[PDB]
Coordinates of C-alpha atoms and ligand atoms in Angstrom, one line a residue:
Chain B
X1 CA 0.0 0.0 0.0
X2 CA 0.7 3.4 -0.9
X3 CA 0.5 6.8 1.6
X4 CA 1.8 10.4 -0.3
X5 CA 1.9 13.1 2.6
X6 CA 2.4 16.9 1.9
X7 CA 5.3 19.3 3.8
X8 CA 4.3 20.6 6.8
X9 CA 3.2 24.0 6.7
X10 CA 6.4 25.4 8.2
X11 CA 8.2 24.1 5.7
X12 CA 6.8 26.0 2.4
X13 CA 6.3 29.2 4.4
X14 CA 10.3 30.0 5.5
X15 CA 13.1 29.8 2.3
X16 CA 15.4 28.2 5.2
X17 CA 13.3 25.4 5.8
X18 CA 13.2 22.1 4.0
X19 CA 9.5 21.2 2.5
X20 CA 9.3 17.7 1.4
X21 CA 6.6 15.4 0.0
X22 CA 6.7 11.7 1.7
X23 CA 6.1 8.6 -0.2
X24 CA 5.6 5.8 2.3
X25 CA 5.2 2.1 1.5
X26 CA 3.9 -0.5 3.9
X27 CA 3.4 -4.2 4.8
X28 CA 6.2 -4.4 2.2
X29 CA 7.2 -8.8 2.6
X30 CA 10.5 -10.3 4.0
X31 CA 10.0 -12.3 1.0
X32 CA 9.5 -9.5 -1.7
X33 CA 11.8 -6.9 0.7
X34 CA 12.9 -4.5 -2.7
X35 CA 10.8 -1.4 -3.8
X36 CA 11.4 1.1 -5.9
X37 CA 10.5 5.2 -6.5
X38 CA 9.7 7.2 -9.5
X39 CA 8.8 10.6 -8.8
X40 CA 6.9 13.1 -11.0
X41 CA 6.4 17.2 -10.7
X42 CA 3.4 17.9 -12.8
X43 CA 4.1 14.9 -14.7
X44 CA 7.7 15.6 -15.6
X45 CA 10.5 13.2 -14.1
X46 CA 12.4 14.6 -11.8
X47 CA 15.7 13.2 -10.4
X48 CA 16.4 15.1 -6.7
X49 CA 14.3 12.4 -4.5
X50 CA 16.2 10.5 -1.7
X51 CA 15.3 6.8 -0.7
X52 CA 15.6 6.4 3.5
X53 CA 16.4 3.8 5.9
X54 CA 13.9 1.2 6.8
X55 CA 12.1 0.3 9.6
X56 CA 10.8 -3.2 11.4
X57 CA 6.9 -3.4 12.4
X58 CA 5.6 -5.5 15.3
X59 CA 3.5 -7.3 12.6
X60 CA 7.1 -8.5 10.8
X61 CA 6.3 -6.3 8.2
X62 CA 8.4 -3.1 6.4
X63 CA 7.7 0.4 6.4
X64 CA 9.8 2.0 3.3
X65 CA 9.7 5.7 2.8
X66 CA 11.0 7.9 0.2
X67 CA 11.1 11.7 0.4
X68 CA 11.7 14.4 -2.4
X69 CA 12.3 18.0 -1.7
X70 CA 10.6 20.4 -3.0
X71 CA 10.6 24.3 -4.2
X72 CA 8.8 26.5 -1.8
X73 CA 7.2 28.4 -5.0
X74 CA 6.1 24.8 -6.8
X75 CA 4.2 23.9 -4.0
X76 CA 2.7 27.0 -3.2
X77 CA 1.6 27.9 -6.7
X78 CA 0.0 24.6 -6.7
X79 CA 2.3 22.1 -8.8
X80 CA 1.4 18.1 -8.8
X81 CA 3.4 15.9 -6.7
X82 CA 2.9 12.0 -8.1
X83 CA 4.9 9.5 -6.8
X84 CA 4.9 5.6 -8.3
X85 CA 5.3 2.4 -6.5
X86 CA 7.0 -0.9 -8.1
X87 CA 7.4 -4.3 -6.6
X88 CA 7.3 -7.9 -7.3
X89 CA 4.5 -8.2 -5.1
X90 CA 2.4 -5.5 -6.4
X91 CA 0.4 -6.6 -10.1
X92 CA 1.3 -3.0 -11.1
X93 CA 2.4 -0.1 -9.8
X94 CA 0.5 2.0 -7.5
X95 CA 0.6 6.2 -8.1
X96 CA -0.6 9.1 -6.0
X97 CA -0.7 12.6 -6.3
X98 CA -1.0 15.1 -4.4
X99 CA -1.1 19.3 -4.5
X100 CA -2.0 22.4 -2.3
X101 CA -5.6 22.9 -1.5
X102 CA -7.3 24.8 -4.4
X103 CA -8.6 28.4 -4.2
X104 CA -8.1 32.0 -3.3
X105 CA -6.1 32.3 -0.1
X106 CA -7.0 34.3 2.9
X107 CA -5.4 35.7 5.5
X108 CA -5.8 35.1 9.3
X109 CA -7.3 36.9 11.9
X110 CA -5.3 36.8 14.9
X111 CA -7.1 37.9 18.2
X112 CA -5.5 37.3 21.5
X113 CA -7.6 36.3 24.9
X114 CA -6.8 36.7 28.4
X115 CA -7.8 33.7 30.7
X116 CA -11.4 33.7 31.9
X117 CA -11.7 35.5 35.8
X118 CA -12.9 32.2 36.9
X119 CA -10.0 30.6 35.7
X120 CA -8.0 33.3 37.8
X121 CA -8.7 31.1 40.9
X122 CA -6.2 28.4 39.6
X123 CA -2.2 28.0 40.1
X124 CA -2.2 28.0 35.8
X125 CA -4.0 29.9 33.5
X126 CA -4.6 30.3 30.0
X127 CA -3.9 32.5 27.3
X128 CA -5.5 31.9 24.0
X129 CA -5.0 32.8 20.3
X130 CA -7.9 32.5 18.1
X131 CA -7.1 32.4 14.7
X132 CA -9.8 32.6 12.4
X133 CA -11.1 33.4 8.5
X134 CA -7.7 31.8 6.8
X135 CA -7.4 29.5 3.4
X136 CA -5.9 27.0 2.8
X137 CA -6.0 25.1 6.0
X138 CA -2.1 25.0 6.3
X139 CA -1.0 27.5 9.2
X140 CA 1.3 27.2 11.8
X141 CA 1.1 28.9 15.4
X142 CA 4.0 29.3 18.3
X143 CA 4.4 31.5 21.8
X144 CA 7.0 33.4 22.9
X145 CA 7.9 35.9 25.4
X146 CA 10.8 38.2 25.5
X147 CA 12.2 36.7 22.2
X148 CA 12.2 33.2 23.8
X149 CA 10.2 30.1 22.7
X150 CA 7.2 29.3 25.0
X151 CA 6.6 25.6 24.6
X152 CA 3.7 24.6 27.4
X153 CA 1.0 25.0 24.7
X154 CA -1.7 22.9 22.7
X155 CA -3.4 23.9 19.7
X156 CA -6.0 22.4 17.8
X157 CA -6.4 21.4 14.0
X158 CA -8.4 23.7 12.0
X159 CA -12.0 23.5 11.7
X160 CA -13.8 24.2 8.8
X161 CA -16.3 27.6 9.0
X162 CA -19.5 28.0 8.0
X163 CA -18.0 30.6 5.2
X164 CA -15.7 27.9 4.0
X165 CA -12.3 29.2 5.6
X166 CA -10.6 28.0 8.7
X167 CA -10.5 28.4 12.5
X168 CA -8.1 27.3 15.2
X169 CA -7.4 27.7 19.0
X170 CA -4.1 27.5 20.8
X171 CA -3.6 27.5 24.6
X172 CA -0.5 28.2 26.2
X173 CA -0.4 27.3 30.0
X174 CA 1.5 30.0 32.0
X175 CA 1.9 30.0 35.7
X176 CA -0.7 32.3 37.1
X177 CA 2.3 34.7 38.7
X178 CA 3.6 35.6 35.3
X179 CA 0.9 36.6 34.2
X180 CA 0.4 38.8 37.1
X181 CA 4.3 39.9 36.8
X182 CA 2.9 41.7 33.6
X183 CA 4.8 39.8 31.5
X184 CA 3.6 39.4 27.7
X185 CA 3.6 36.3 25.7
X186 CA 2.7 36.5 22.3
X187 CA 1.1 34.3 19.8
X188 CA 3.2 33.6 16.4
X189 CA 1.3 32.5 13.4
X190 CA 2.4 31.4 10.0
X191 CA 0.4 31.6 6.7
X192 CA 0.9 31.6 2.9
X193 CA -1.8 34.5 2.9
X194 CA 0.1 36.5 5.9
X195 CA 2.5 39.3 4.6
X196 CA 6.5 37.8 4.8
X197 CA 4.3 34.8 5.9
X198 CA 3.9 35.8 9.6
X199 CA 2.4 38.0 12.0
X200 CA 2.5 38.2 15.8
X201 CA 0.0 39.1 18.2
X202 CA 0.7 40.0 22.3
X203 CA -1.2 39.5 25.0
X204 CA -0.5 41.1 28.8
X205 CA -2.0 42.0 32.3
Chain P
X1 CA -11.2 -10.0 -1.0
X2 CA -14.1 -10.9 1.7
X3 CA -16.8 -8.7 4.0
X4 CA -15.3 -5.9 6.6
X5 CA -17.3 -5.0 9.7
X6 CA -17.3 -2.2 11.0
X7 CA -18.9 -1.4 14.5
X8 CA -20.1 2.0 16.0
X9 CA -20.8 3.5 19.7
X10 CA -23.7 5.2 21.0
X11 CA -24.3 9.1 20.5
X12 CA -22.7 10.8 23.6
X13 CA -25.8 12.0 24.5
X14 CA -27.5 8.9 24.1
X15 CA -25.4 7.5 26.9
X16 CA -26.3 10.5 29.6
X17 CA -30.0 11.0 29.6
X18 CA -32.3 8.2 30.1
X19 CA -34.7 9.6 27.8
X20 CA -32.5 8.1 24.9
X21 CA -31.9 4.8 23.5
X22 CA -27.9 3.8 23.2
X23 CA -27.2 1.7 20.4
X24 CA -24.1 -0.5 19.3
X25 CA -24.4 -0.7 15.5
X26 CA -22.4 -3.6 13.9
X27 CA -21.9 -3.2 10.0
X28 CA -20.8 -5.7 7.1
X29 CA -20.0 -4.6 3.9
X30 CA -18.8 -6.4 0.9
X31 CA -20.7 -9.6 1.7
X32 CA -21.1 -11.4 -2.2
X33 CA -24.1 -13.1 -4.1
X34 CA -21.5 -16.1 -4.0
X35 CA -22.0 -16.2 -0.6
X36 CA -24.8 -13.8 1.2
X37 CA -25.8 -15.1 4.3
X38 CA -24.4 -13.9 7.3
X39 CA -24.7 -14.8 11.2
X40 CA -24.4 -12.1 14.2
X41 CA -23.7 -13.3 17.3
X42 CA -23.3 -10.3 20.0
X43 CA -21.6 -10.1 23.6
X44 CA -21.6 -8.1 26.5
X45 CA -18.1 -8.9 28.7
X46 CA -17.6 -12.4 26.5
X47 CA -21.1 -13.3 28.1
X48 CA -23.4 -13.9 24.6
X49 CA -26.5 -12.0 24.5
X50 CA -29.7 -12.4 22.1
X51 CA -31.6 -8.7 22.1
X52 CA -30.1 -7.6 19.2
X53 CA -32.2 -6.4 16.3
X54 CA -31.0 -7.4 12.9
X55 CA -31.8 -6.2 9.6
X56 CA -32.5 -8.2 6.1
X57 CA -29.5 -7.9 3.7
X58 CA -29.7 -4.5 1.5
X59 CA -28.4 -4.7 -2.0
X60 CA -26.0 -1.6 -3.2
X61 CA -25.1 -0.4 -6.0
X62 CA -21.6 -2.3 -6.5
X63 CA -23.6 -5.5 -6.1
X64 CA -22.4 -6.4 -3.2
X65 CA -25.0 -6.7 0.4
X66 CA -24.7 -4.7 3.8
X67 CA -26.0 -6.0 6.5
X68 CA -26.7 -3.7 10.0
X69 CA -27.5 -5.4 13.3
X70 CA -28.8 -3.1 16.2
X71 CA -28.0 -4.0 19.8
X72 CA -29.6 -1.4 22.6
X73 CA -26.9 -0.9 25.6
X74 CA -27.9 0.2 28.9
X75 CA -26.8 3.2 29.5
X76 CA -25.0 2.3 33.0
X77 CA -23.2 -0.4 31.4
X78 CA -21.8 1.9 28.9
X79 CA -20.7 3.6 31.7
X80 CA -19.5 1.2 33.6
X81 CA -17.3 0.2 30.6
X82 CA -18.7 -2.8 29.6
X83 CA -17.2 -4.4 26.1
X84 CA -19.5 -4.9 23.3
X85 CA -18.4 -7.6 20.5
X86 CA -20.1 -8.3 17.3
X87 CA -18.7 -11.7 15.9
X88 CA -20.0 -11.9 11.8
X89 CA -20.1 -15.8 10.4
X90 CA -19.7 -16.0 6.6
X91 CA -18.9 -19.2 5.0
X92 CA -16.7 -17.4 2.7
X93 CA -14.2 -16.9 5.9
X94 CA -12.2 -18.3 6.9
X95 CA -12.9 -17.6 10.6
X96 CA -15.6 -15.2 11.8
X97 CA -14.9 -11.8 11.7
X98 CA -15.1 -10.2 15.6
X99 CA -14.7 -6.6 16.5
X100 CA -14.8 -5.0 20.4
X101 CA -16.1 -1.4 20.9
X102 CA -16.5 0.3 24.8
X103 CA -16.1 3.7 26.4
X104 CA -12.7 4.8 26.2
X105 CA -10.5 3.0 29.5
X106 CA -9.2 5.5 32.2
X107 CA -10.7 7.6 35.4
X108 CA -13.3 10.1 34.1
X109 CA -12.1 13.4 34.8
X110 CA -15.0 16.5 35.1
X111 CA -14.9 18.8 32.2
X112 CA -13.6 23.1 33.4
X113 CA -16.1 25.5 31.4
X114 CA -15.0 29.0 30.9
X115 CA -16.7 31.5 28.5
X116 CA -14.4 34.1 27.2
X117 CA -16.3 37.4 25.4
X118 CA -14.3 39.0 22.2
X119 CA -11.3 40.0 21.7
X120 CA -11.5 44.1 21.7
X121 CA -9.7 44.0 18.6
X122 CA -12.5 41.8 17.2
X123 CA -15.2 44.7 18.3
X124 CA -14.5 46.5 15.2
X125 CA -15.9 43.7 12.8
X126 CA -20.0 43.5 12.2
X127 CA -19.7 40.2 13.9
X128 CA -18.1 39.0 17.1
X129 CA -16.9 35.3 18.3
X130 CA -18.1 34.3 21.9
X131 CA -16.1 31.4 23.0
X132 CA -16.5 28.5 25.4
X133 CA -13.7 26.7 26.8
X134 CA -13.9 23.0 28.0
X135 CA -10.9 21.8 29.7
X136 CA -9.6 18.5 31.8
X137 CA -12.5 16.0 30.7
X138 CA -11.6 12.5 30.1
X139 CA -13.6 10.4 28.3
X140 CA -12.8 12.3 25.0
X141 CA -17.1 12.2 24.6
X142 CA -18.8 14.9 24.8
X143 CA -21.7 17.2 24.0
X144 CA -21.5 20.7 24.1
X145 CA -24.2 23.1 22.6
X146 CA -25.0 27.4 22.5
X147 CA -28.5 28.7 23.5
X148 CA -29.7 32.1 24.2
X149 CA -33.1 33.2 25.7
X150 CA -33.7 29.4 26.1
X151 CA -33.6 29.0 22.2
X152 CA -31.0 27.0 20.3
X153 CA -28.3 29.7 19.0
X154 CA -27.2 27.7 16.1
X155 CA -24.0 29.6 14.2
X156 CA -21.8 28.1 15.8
X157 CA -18.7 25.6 15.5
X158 CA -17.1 23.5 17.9
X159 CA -13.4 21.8 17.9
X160 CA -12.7 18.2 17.9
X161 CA -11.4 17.6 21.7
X162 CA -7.8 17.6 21.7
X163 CA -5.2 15.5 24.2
X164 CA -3.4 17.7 26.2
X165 CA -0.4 17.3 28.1
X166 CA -1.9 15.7 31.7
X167 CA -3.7 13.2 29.5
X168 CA -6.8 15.1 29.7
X169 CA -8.6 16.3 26.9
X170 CA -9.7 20.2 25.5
X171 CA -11.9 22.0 23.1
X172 CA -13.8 25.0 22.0
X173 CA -16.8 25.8 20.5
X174 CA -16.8 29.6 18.8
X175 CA -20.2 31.2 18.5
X176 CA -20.6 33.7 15.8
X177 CA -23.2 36.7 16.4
X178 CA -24.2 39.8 15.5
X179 CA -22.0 42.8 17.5
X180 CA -25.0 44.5 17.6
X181 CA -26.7 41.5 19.8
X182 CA -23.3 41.4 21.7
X183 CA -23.7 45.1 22.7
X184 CA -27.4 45.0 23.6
X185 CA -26.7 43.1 26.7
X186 CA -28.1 39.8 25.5
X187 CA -27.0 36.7 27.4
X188 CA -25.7 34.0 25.6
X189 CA -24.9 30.4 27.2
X190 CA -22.5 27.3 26.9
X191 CA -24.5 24.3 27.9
X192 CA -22.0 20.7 28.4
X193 CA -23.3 17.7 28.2
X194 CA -20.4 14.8 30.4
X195 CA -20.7 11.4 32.5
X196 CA -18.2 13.7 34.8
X197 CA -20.7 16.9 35.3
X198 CA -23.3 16.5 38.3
X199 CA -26.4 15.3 36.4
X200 CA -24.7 15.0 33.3
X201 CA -24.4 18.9 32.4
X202 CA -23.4 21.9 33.0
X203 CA -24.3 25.6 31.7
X204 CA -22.3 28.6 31.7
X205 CA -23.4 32.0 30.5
X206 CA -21.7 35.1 28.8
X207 CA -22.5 38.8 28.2
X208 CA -21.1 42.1 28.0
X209 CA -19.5 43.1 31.3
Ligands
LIG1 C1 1.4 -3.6 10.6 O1 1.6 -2.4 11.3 C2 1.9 -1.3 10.5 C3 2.2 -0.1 11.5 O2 1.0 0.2 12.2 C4 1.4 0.5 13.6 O3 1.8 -0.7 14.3 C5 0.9 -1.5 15.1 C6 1.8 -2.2 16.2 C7 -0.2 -0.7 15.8 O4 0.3 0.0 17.0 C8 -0.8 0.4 14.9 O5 -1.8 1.1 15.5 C9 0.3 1.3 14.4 O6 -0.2 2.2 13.5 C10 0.7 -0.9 9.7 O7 1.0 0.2 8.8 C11 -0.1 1.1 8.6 O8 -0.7 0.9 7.4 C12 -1.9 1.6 7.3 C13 -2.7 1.1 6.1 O9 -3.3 -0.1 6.4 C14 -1.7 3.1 7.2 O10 -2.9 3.8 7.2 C15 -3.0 5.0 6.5 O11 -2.6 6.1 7.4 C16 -2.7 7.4 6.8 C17 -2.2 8.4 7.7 O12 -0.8 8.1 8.1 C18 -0.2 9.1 8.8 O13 -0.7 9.3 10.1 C19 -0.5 8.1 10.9 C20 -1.1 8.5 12.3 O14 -2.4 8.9 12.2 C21 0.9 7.7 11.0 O15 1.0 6.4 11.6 C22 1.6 7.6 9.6 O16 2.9 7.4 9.7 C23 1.3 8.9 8.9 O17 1.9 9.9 9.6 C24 2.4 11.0 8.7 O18 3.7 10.6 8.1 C25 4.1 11.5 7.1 C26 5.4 10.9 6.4 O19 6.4 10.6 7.4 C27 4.4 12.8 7.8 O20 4.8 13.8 6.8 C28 3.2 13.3 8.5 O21 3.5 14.5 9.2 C29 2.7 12.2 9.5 N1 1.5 12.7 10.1 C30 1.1 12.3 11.3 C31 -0.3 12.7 11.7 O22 1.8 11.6 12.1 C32 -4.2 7.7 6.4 O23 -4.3 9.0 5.7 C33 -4.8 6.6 5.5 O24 -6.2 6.9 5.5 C34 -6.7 6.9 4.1 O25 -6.8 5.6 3.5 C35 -7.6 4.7 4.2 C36 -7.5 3.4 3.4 O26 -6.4 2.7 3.8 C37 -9.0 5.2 4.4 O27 -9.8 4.3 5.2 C38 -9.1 6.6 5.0 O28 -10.4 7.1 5.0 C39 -8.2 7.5 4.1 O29 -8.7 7.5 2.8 C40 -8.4 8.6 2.0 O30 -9.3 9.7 2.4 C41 -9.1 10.9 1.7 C42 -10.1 11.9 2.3 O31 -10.0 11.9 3.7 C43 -9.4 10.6 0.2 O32 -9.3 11.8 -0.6 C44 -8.5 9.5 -0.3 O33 -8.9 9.2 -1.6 C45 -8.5 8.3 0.6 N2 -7.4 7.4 0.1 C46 -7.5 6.1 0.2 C47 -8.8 5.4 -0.3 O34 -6.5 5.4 0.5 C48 -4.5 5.3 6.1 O35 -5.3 5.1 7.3 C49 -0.8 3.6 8.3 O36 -0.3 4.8 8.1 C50 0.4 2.6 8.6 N3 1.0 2.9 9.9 C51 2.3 3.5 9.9 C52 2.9 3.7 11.3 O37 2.9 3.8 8.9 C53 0.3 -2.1 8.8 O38 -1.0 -1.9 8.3 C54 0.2 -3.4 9.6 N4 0.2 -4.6 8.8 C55 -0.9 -5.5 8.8 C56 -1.3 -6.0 10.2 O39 -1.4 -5.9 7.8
LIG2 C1 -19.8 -1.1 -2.1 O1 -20.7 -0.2 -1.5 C2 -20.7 -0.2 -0.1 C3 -21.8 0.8 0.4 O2 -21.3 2.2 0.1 C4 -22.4 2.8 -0.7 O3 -22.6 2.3 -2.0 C5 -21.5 2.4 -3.0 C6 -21.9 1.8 -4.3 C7 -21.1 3.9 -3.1 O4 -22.2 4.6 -3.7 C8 -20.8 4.5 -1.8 O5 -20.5 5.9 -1.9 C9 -22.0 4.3 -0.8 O6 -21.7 4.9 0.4 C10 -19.3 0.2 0.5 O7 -19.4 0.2 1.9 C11 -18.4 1.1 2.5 O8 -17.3 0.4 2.8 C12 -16.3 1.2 3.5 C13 -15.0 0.3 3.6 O9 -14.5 0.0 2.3 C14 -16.7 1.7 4.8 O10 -15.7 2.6 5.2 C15 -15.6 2.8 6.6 O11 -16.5 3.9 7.0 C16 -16.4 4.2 8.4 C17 -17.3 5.4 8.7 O12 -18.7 4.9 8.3 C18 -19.6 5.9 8.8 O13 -19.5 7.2 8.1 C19 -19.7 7.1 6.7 C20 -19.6 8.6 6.2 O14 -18.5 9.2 6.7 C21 -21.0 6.5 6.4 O15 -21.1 6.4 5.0 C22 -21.3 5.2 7.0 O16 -22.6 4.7 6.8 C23 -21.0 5.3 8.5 O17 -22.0 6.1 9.0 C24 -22.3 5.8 10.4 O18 -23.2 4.7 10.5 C25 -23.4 4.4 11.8 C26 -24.1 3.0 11.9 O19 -25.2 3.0 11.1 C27 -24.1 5.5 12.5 O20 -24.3 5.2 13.9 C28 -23.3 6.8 12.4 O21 -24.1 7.9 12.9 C29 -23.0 7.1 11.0 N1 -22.1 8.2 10.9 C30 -22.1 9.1 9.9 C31 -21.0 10.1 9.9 O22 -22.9 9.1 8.9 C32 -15.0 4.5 8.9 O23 -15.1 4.6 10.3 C33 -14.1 3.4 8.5 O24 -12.7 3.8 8.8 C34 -12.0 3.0 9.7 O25 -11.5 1.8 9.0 C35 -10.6 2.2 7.9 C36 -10.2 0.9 7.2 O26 -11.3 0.4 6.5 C37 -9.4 3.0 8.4 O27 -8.6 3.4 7.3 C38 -9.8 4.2 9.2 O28 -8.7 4.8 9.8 C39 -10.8 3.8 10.3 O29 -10.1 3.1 11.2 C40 -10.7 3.3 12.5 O30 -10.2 4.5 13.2 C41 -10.8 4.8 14.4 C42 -10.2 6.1 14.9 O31 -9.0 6.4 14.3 C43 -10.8 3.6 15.4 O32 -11.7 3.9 16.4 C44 -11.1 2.3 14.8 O33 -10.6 1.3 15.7 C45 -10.4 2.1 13.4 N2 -10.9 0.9 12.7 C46 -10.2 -0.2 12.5 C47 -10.2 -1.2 13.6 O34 -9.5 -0.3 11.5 C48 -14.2 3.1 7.0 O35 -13.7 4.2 6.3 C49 -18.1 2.5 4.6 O36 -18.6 2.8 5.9 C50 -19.1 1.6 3.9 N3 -20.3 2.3 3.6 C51 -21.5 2.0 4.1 C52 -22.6 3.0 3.8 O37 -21.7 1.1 4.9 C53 -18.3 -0.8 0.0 O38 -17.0 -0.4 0.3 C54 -18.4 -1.0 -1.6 N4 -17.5 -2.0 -2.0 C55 -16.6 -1.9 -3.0 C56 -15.8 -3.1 -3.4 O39 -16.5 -0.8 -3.7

């Protein structure tokens, strides 16, 4: 069987990253253990994908991946992704392709939210970034304070809207005396549609 | 290439107020005109039970049958985490087919509701986002719902609940209204539906300070 899995969001958004499209093969046989890659970018051959190292299951089966880097730009501007699948096992080979969601972006909304007064009775409390109105679904969202990373949050996957663009939530736990310390954390988000792909929203006492 | 089952839980609010009916819903799928017949047998804790109700074969449009049986849980046993099994006998298989469904395994864990009003920055736009916040429930299932003036306020969305670090889970469901409705004064309220909540729910309410 055949899984093709698109970069992480991240990845296509920052020129210093490394977006890559994932071809992974599974219950691949001890007995037919070989399995080739052909990749294709809008149906042209291209050459730059790189085989990895294989894994074991607890089933005694074999999980082979392949991974192809890709251009920032391609992906963005929607180019096809179609990788092929040959083994001795397989009748023929299997393909899938994949591509950025289709349609007119749209930018995010970023609105910060102190933590409710009854949560104020707690030893943590929360801070929240809603982040709403944005196309395609592929975003990122950190914290920080004072240039630092903040790493005690959770954030959920988007949720399509009524109007047909996206909403999230992140949460970022802070001990209820920095809060009260006036420090300010601020909410990071990341977004094809964002101008230089990000914007940054704070949120204080 | 024989028949898959797949089997279903109850609603979560099916399993909260006794005024609904829980169901366990056992489906087969690609069953052939080779070989149509099919047998459920159905257990509670390995301990077989015969209540089910069990539907004639339907025809699709692949030509191949599905086949649905039915079986009512008490809502306690649910609860209590009880293991439903649907075994499917097909004599096409080689062996029957058995799947296990139950309430997810673990403490329950009551569910923190905090309504948060808009953002100011949000007060410029013709409509505003109210939001409820359910935190630290465990079982992920849940029911959560918006009403104002004892009327269903039905614009809104809700997230799927989210693991969080202490093994808990979150969410939040956004309403969307009106500013103008928001600045009146109107109150508008977060009603959560949990085996963890006193009676099964809770209800917590939001206007403008
Ligand atoms: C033996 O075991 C191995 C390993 O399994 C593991 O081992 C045992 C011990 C247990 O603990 C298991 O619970 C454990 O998982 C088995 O290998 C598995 O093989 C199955 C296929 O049978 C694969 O299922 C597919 O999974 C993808 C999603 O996969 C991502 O997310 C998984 C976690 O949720 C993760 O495990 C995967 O690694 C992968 O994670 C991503 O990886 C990429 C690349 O590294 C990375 O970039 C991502 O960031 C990363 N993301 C995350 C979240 O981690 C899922 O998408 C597939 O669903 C589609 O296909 C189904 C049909 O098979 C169908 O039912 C679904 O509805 C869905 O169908 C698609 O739907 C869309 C619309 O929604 C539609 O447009 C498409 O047309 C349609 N496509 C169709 C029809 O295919 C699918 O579920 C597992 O990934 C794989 N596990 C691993 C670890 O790789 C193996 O099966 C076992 N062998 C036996 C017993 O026979
Ligand atoms: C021939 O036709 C039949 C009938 O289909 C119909 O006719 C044909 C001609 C076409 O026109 C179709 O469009 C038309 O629908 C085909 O039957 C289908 O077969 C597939 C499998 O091949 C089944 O797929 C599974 O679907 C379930 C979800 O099913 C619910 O939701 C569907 C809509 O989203 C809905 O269509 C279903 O009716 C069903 O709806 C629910 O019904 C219950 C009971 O009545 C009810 O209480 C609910 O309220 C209702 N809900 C809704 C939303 O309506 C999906 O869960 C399955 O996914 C699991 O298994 C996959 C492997 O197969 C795996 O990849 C997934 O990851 C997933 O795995 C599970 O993951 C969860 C959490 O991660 C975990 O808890 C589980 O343990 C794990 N499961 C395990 C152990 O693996 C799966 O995708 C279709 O349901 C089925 N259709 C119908 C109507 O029965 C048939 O395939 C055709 N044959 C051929 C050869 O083409």
């Amino acid at each position: 069987s055949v899984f093709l899995f698109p970069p992480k969001p991240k990845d296509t958004l920052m020129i210093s990253r490394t977006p890559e499209v994932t071809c992974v093969v599974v219950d691949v046989s001890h007995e037919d253990p070989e399995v080739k890659f052909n990749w294709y970018v809008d149906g042209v051959e291209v050459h730059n994908a790189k085989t990895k190292p294989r894994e074991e299951q607890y089933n005694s089966t074999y999980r082979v991946v392949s991974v192809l880097t890709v251009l920032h730009q391609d992906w963005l501007n929607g180019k096809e992704y179609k990788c092929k699948v040959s083994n001795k096992a397989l009748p023929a080979p299997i393909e899938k392709t994949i591509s950025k969601a289709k349609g007119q972006p749209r930018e995010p909304q970023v609105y910060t939210l102190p933590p409710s007064r009854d949560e104020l009775t707690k030893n943590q409390v929360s801070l929240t970034c809603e982040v709403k109105g944005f196309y395609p679904s592929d975003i990122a969202v950190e914290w920080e304070s004072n240039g630092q990373p903040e790493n005690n949050y959770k954030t959920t996957p988007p949720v399509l809207d009524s109007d047909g663009s996206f909403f999230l939530y992140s949460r970022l736990t802070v001990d209820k005396s920095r809060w009260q310390q006036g420090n300010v954390f601020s909410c990071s988000v990341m977004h094809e549609a964002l101008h230089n792909h990000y914007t940054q929203k704070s949120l204080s006492l």
